[PDB]
A paper describes a structure:
To explore binding determinants underlying specificity of this compound, we obtained an initial cryo-EM reconstruction of the muscle-type receptor bound to rocuronium at an overall resolution of 2.8 Å. Further focused classification revealed two distinct states of the receptor, one with rocuronium bound in the pore and one without. Both structures contained clear density for rocuronium in both classical neurotransmitter sites, with loop C propped open by the ligand and the ECD in an expanded conformation characteristic of antagonist-bound and apo Cys-loop receptors. Rocuronium primarily makes contacts with the principal (αδ and αγ) subunits in both states. The decreased number of interactions on the complementary subunit compared to succinylcholine may explain why rocuronium is able to bind not only muscle-type but also neuronal type receptors. In the conformation with rocuronium bound only in the neurotransmitter binding sites, the receptor adopts an overall conformation like the apo resting state. The extracellular domain is more expanded than seen in the agonist-bound structures, and the channel pore contains hydrophobic constrictions in its upper half. This extensive hydrophobic barrier was seen in previous apo and antagonist-bound structures and would prevent ion permeation. In this rocuronium-bound structure, the upper position of the α-M4 helices retain map density sufficient for modeling and remain in close apposition to the coupling region, contrasting with desensitized states where one or more α-M4 helices are detached. Together, this first rocuronium complex shows how the non-depolarizing blocker prevents channel activation by competing with agonist, inhibits the conformational transition to an activated state, and stabilizes the pore in a resting-like nonconducting state.
Residue numbers in the entry:
A (entry chain E): 1 to 329, 410 to 489
B (entry chain A), E (entry chain D): 1 to 331, 370 to 433
C (entry chain C): 1 to 334, 398 to 469
D (entry chain B): 2 to 341, 416 to 500
The structure:
């Protein structure tokens, strides 16, 4: 027969899983945590939640579950379901949903010296407040806060697992099996034990283990689907200055159509940005900038059309403006002759009116050239600055600014 | 620990968890209730639901769970599963669609004097009367009502732990500001009988919305469209683009209606502030389009069919142009040949007369455009200020 | 009562609900499987899932639950909680989620003869493949496969349920008029039931309930087809607009915008399967291509209208086709000072004559444009009418068969 | 605490079996009186036709086994027992959507010394009620909550409406109970009627679970403000803008642009409206009828603008202005519509040629002007014929919508108000 | 059955289900694991999650559960609740967001020799690397890794039932075609110790997308818009609608970009094929608009302020039109009266000269349009073929 049966029936007989295994008064149970990251499933900006698949390793000593191997044919390791044993109530505190516990309650590995090794896998959804300032050229700093929801610092002592005498102060990632998220890349992954000094060694919240994930976005999707089309469409507003300023030129058509396309892009971006209202995202800043510039260019096109279509009758072209712009910048015979003279006079007058119209058109063209140069410079500088601020938004070199250590294996 | 194992075995040997912890059935258990707000997960204006992550701190004394520490190796406190002992059934009276009572049966702390401390976590989804009159500059006041479901005040009495909820460890929302918070205890009696009070504790949190997301995402585009609305009046009618421009502004606003519909709450209790503003913008654009159509019709009036009324000439050609200071607008075969030349000359007479009349019509249209540009810029500014500044000054 | 307590204690002293009730080793338990449809909630086509609210009318015999009513004050039947008796693990096998079992465990009815009856309620999400070819003018054939998850044909024998006064089997889904809500988007045409075996596996047997349902396409008719018809009318009308108006491109390209907007509207409603193209999408693509060709021909007509001798020379074939032949078919059918002054007048006359000839050639080009535009008007009208009528009759001839074949 | 002894006597010493009905003889019927209290109406999202509500189910029955003499113990006049220890009547919402038949929170029961047991568990219920879209958004819905006892047949337990007393006479509570103080009105819906009924089905049999029923009805009216503000008024104004196309001169090449843009805006409004309603096909919604009518009318306006432009641009070189057309569109309709030495020989020949050319050009121009006048007449006629149709159709449609109040008395054949103010007798 | 009742009573009296079913603790339990794929529920490209409906067949011997048929009326097989006996803890190692282990504890088939057959159902939501490079013509290789969580290979050994997953009762997907499927067993050792193998079984399925839905609903409208943007160059400048057509095509493409973002996955690992084609179409339309503006500017070139450069005339008026074979393009008061007539004649001369220069500019613009029409039709065809032909040929 299986000796494990006799051994386990002996161990669990007269065993109370409600009772912390503190050997005596003032004995503190050491619980060591080691987090392994299997998959970074996603980071939902709308919900401000990070979903991860982790294997959390919890180790402690339970003196009641020790045995002498010589009495059980050298058995030194048994598996007992975790629901039969006392467990330290290590839970994820900063969970968005009400899921504090692990997902699968694996068996606990129990060694003959009382050492207990529990490796339950878990799917966790933790709160990650989103820094939207540089979205989509942003990096986030998410944390997983672990603490015991039952016992305080007088009863348990949360520590980071130590391997071969060196503290494992980082999230463990197996190089081969780990798969890149596809939207996020992990730059730093430190772990440290934290204290809430506002509390005393009671309250169960005094101590905690925090695992940090400093992740950088890969903005290829946004660049290809929103940024580049938006920039190309918005740059079209500088073309209005080369269209003729009369009916059929279609200055207003082009400018207002570009503005309408930018409105469509505003609707498109409204569905991606997080709803928090502490900062304006970089992409939103750029859309506002281009919309304002397009409004200005529509105004300038309207002004140019008004200037170019002026007539001697509605407006008078004062010589000051001309200098300013075109500078620094038988009775039958009697009746027949009367008719001929009147014809010549009318033709002369019409030609003169035409000439004045052409003067106004030239003034309009000069204004077009000047405003084109101004608008090209403005648009180029604004776009370059806005999308160069994001390119220089780099993750800090160190996981903790003032800490020299790199926190890597 | 063998001492603690023996203690726990002895405490629950003859313990009935359905009986109240009172020495005599006429007494009442006194429970100190405290609420610890940890996070404001979300507010749903359409469904009037406020979701919060809280801890419900409950303290009371169970006389049946005493022991002498000297008999148990000096043990003074233990942790017990909450399912092992009598618990008070505190229920969120104004629950919307969450859980009515505590579902996370966490462990509780028990002193050797019977004093019990229990702080289970919970997610409260409460019914929140939302007021959208001043959206997005709106302040919301809504509560969490708590009480013992099945016991009256003569069996189980609940008293608040402090004067207000504990927000010591409250995560900052990023969308709301906790202006104030407090908790009040109420005694409710019924016509039955005045000897059976019914107690509850209401915690209310006054929240102020942070109006930046909605500002930049809704109000600013509305301002651009409003500003462009009156721009059409400076555009001359000769360029066949007055209707193009105004109608494109209207289409842009109609497309933006999608953004508003998907962003602002869909309640029907009252009209939001931005709802009034956007309706104003719509009517503004439509009026501009109507008057632009009128002006275009006026500009193209032909002398042959329409003759200028005297009052139109008197007003728009003589009076108003004088009082427009900003504008720079001004204020054998020989007999056949001879007969043909005369005919040409008289035809030019007629052409010049018709051209002059059409020019007068065009001038009147231009004057109307200038007046309308002034009026519409003024109306835009006045309407925006009237809609917004009234609420903005109060802040 | 006290006697009910005594009877229950006697019945369940050594009763084991884990053991299937068989008088003798080798006996089979006959289980009658019936279904009552209370409400056909949804037929989500995005996930190919039908949600229904049903009752399972199960009946079998348990020899262990037998008693003499004379000895128990004439107690003829008991209502025993369903978990206290053996029950067959009748489940929905073709469920889309992982929910095989019932939701509400109503207690069983046990009669003194050993006849057990159980009518649990459930909200089932079954998976039925959607034939997306005539959508939204389509009928679907969604099934619900019921069998014992554990026991096979060597242990239980599935049968059809009996009617209220059990005399003959009921081979259909039962619908209780007192409690039944019409879907409002689906009409139930047939609802048969049948037992199915498998030739390869002799231990398999199930009872399948088939729902043949026809969609009511009013919503889609209005919200997609009517606007498409109006847009097609505009696309035809573009060819009646004179080229001088400068509005052909506005009309045609705005029609194209409208069609793509309707495609955006329809995106979130058509099932995303790749076995076929739904008829509505085919109609949208036909209208889209028709509008695109209207745009192309409008561009061609505008190009023809704005030609002049200064740029183009009119070839013989264009003249013959568009001026001689087509019009009748389309019903169009159209002293130093004195010498200086004399020279000036002569020059003016020559200029007028040259302008007259130039204008005549331009008018020939514009007439060619007019004739081509009329021809395109007629051709597009005919094509649009024929195509729309063909597609709509094809859609309207799609009806579920008279015989369900099940 | 005497309660411990009393409860031990009731449940353990007497051998209480919670799986057995509380009847002394197995032929009597247990009467369960139940009532419903509506804590708040959460939602009636019409897309999937689900009514979410927070309700408190009130239960009451007698249990002769849970009786005691209050004097034999201390004067204990009431007990609180968990429902897992006593017999409980399983009354389930039959017409639920999500698969939740039971109450949310199994609270304690209350027991008096005479065996009277009251149970008041709260619940969140998601019932299915079909949506009548006929007058959307001026519609009122009639949603129902149907409760059945599926654990016992009618011969074993009888469901009844709870009763109350005012002045010594008890009456049934035939309505949903609403606490005027605690209840907060829904953002979108107003409750008009709230009857309660016990339904028997005589075509079934008492020895079945489909024979009895207790139904609570909620006749609620939508508050049409969100839709009036955001959907109807802008659409109505943009549609009225289509009539201005006729007042816009043909010289301004923007008639077609205006009409087509109006049609595009109406298509956007159709897209917006399509998402707000279920896919049912019982009827076309009122807003849908209006959108279809107005879109058809605007398409007609576009066609008529196209015809007018085709008329305006005809010339003598391509069209003939017949006498019939001239009389109709220049005399009759404008009146009805109240509308407003060889060198000298060569010189002489050249001037004669110039004169002839000018005369021909003048005739061409005047006939072009005649075509322009014909186009203007067609515009005026079209406006006079279409603007009144648009205005009258809109007014008629929306006053029909605004005249759709609920019947003011549920159960058409019933003269009873089912109002909490006037209980029967 | 009284025989089976007695058998079950005697078969679990002293059965501890926490203990492994081995006669001696140095032996191992040999479990035959087989996977049966019933249905491919969905493939989530954004989160890289594949949802499958499977049956996880498991077979092993439990010597403690054997009996002699002759003592129980010849019973040879019974059904037991799976929660009554020891079960192997098979876990889906690459679970994304589903259950890690079996949760539906269905009954198992127990043979009189101790042989056990357990086939519980499951929904596996497994993480798998999605490669969107040839989307929608993409082939995916997604796996299911299974293994015993808490036992090594010396205590519990799993071996595949067969070398392939069972797809006998597979449901045809309608979106994916199952190219291939196989299962492999791996031995994994650690630097600890080479005597303790850790076993896992990996099942992988090669899936080919059926690219009809995406073709029709995305690619065809893009082709149509590309064709129209190419067409813009045949529209004469005199009809003032070139900008209307080109910018309306751009607006249609923007609305369709909205549609695409609604439909196509939002991955970011690499640019899909549709992404490259959409970007190419956008750049195509933008270049078309720019060159259209250039042509319009050239057409309305004032001869008064500009004079045609000699090279422009040489190229566009002399040589280029000759090589365009398919085209049809061309290859007292009497003194005052006399002076007035002379003035009319000389003004006509000047107007004729100006008109000739303007007509030359228009001719140059028209020639440029012909050249660009050919060029842009060629580019449209070439790019459309280039983006897709490689993948289409690979298939
Ligand atoms: C364990 O048991 C063996 C007998 O099998 C004994 O010799 C040995 O001393 C025991 N170990 C200890 C630490 O006492």
């Amino acid at each position: 027969e299986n000796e494990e049966g006799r051994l386990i029936e002996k161990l669990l007989g007269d065993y109370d899983k409600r009772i912390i295994p503190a050997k005596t008064l003032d004995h503190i149970i050491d619980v060591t945590l080691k987090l392994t990251l299997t998959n970074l499933i996603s980071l939902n900006e709308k919900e401000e939640a990070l979903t991860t698949n982790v294997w959390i390793e919890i180790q402690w000593n339970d003196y009641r579950l020790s045995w002498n191997t010589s009495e059980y044919e050298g058995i030194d390791l048994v598996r007992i379901p975790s629901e039969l044993l006392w467990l330290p109530d290590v839970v994820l505190e900063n969970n968005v949903d009400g899921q504090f516990e692990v997902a699968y309650y694996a068996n606990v590995l129990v060694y003959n010296d009382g050492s207990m090794y529990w490796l339950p896998p878990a799917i966790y959804r933790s709160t990650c407040p989103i820094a939207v300032t540089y979205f989509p050229f942003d990096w986030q700093n998410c944390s997983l806060v672990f603490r015991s929801q039952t016992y305080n610092a007088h009863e348990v002592n949360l520590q980071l697992s130590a391997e071969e005498g060196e503290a494992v102060e980082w999230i463990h990632i197996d190089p081969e099996d780990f798969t890149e998220n596809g939207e996020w890349t992990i730059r730093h992954r430190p772990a440290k034990k934290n204290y809430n000094w506002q509390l005393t060694k009671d309250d169960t919240d005094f101590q905690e283990i925090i695992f940090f994930l400093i992740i950088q976005r890969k903005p290829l999707f946004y660049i290809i689907n929103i940024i580049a089309p938006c920039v190309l469409i918005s740059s079209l507003v500088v073309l209005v200055y080369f269209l003729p300023a009369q009916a059929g030129g279609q200055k207003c058509t082009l400018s207002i159509s570009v503005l309408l396309a930018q409105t469509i892009f505003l609707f498109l971006i409204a569905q991606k940005v997080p709803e928090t209202s502490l900062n304006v995202p970089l992409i939103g800043k750029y859309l506002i900038f281009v919309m304002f510039v397009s409004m200005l260019i529509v105004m300038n096109c309207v002004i140019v059309l008004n200037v170019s279509l002026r007539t001697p009758n509605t407006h008078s072209l004062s010589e000051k403006i001309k200098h300013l712009f075109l500078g620094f910048l038988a009775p039958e015979i009697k009746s027949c002759v009367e008719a001929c003279n009147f014809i010549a006079k009318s033709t002369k007058e019409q030609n003169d009116s035409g000439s004045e119209n052409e003067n106004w058109v030239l003034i309009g063209k000069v204004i077009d050239k000047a405003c084109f140069w101004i608008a090209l410079l403005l648009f180029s500088i604004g776009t370059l600055a806005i999308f160069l601020t994001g390119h220089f938004n780099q993750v800090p070199e160190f996981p903790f600014p003032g800490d020299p250590r790199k926190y890597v294996p | 620990s063998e001492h603690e194992t023996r203690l726990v075995a002895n405490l629950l040997e003859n313990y009935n968890k359905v009986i109240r912890p009172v020495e005599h059935h006429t007494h009442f258990v006194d429970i100190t209730v405290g609420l610890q707000l940890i996070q404001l997960i979300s507010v749903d204006e359409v469904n009037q639901i406020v979701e919060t992550n809280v801890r419900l701190r409950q303290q009371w004394i169970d006389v049946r769970l005493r022991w002498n520490p000297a008999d148990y190796g000096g043990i003074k406190k233990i942790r017990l599963p909450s399912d092992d002992v009598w618990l008070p059934d505190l229920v969120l009276y104004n629950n919307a669609d969450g859980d009515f009572a505590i579902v996370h049966m966490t462990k509780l702390l028990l002193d050797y004097t019977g004093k019990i401390m229990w702080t289970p976590p919970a997610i409260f989804k409460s019914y929140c009367e939302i007021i959208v009159t001043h959206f997005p500059f709106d302040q919301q006041n809504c509560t969490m009502k708590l009480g013992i479901w099945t016991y009256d005040g003569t069996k189980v009495s609940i008293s608040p732990e402090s004067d207000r909820p504990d927000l010591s460890t409250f995560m900052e929302s990023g969308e709301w500001v906790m202006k104030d918070y407090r908790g009040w205890k109420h005694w409710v009696y019924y016509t039955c009988c005045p000897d059976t009070p019914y107690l509850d504790i209401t915690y209310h949190f006054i929240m102020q919305r942070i109006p930046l997301y909605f500002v930049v995402n809704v109000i600013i585009p509305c301002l651009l469209f409003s500003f462009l609305t009156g721009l059409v009046f400076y555009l001359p009618t000769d360029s066949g683009e007055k209707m193009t421009l105004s109608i494109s502004v209207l289409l842009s606003l109609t497309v933006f209606l999608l953004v508003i519909v998907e962003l602002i709450p869909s309640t029907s209790s009252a009209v939001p502030l931005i709802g009034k503003y956007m309706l104003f913008t719509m009517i503004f654009v439509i009026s501009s389009i109507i008057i632009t159509v009128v002006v275009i019709n006026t500009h193209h009036r032909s002398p042959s069919t329409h003759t200028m009324p005297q009052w139109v000439r008197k007003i728009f050609i003589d009076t108003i142009p004088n009082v427009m200071f900003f504008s720079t607008m001004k204020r054998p075969d020989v007999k056949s040949a001879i007969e043909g030349v005369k005919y040409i000359a008289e035809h030019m007479k007629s052409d010049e007369e018709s051209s002059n009349a059409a020019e007068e019509w065009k001038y009147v249209a231009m004057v109307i455009d200038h007046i309308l540009l002034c009026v519409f810029m003024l109306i835009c500014i006045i309407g925006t200020v009237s809609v917004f500044a009234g609420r903005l000054i109060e802040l | 009562s006290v006697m009910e307590d005594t009877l229950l204690s006697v019945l369940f002293e050594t009763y084991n609900p884990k053991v299937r009730p068989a008088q003798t080793v080798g006996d089979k338990v006959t289980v009658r499987v019936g279904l009552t449809l209370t409400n056909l909630l949804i037929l989500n086509e995005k996930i190919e899932e039908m949600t229904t609210n049903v009752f399972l009318n199960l009946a079998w015999t348990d020899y262990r639950l037998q008693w003499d009513p004379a000895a128990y004050e004439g107690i003829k039947d008991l209502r025993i909680p369903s978990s206290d008796v053996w029950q067959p693990d009748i489940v929905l096998m073709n469920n889309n989620d992982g929910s095989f079992e019932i939701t509400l465990h109503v207690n069983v009815l046990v009669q003194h003869t050993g006849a057990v009856s159980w009518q649990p309620s459930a909200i089932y999400r079954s998976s039925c493949t959607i034939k997306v070819m005539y959508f939204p003018f389509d009928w679907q054939n969604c099934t619900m496969v019921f069998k014992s998850y554990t026991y096979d044909t060597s242990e239980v024998t599935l049968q059809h349920a009996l009617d209220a006064k059990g005399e003959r089997e009921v081979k259909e889904i039962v619908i209780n008029k007192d409690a039944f809500t019409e879907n409002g988007q689906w009409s139930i045409e047939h609802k048969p039931s049948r037992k199915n075996w498998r030739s390869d596996d002799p231990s398999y047997e199930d009872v399948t309930f088939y729902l043949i349902i026809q969609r009511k396409p009013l919503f889609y008719i209005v919200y997609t087809i009517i606007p498409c018809i109006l847009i097609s009318i505009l696309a035809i009308l573009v060819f009646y607009l004179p080229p001088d108006a400068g509005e052909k491109m506005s009309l045609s390209i705005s029609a194209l915008l409208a069609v793509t907007v309707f495609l955006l509207l329809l995106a979130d409603k058509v099932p995303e399967t790749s076995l076929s193209v739904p008829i509505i999408i085919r109609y949208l693509m036909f209208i889209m291509i028709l509008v695109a060709f209207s745009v192309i021909l409008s561009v061609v007509v505008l190009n023809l209208h704005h030609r002049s001798p200064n740029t183009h020379t009119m070839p013989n074939w264009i003249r013959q086709i568009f001026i001689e032949t087509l019009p009748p078919f389309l019903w169009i059918q159209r002293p130093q000072d004195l010498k200086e002054a004399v020279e000036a007048i002569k020059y003016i006359a020559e200029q007028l004559e040259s302008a007259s000839e130039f204008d005549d050639l331009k008018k020939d080009w514009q007439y060619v444009a007019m004739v081509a535009d009329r021809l395109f008007l007629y051709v597009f009208f005919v094509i649009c009418s024929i195509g729309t009528f063909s597609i709509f009759l094809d859609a309207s001839h799609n009806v579920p068969p008279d015989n369900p074949f099940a | 605490n005497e309660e411990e002894r009393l409860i031990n006597d009731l449940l353990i010493v007497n051998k209480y079996n919670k799986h057995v009905r509380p009847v002394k003889h197995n032929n009597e019927v247990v009467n369960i009186a139940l009532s419903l209290t509506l804590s708040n109406l959460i939602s009636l999202k019409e897309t999937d036709e689900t009514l979410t509500s927070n309700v408190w189910m009130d239960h009451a029955w007698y249990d002769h086994r849970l009786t005691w003499n209050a004097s034999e113990y201390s004067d204990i006049s009431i007990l609180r027992l968990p429902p897992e220890l006593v017999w409980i009547p399983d009354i389930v919402l039959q017409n639920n959507n999500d698969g939740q038949y039971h109450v949310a929170y199994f609270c304690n029961v209350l027991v008096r010394p005479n065996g009277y047991v009251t149970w008041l568990p709260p619940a969140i219920f998601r019932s299915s009620c079909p949506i009548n879209v006929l007058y959307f958004p001026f519609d009122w819905q009639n949603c129902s909550l149907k409760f059945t006892a599926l654990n016992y047949d009618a011969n074993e337990i009888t469901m009844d409406l709870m009763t109350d007393t005012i002045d010594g006479k008890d009456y049934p509570i035939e309505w949903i109970i609403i606490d005027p103080e605690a209840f907060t009105e829904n953002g979108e819906w107003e409750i008009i009627h709230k009857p309660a009924k016990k339904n028997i089905y005589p075509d079934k049999f008492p020895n079945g679970t489909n024979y009895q029923d207790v139904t609570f009805y909620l006749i609620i009216r939508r508050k049409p403000l969100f839709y009036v503000i955001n959907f109807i008024t802008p659409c109505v104004l943009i549609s009225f803008l289509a009539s201005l196309a006729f007042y816009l001169p043909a010289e301004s090449g923007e008639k077609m642009s205006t009409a087509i843009s109006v049609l595009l805006a109406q298509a956007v409004f159709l897209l917006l409206t399509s998402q707000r309603l279920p896919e049912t096909a019982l009827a076309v919604p009122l807003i849908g009828k209006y959108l279809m009518f107005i879109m058809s009318l605007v398409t007609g306006v576009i066609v008529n603008c196209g015809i007018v432009l085709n008329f305006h641009f005809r010339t003598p070189s391509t069209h003939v202005l017949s006498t019939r057309v001239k009389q109709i569109f220049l005399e009759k309709l404008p009146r009805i519509l109240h509308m407003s030495h060889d060198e000298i020989k060569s010189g002489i020949d050249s001037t004669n040629y110039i004169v002839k050319q000018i005369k021909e050009k003048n005739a061409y121009d005047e006939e072009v002007g005649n075509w322009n006048l014909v186009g203007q007449t067609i515009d005026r006629l079209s406006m006079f014929i279409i603007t009144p149709v648009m205005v009258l159709g809109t007014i008629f449609i929306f006053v029909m919508g605004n005249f759709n109040h609920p019947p003011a008395k549920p159960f058409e054949g019933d003269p009873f108000d089912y109002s909490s103010d006037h209980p029967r007798c």
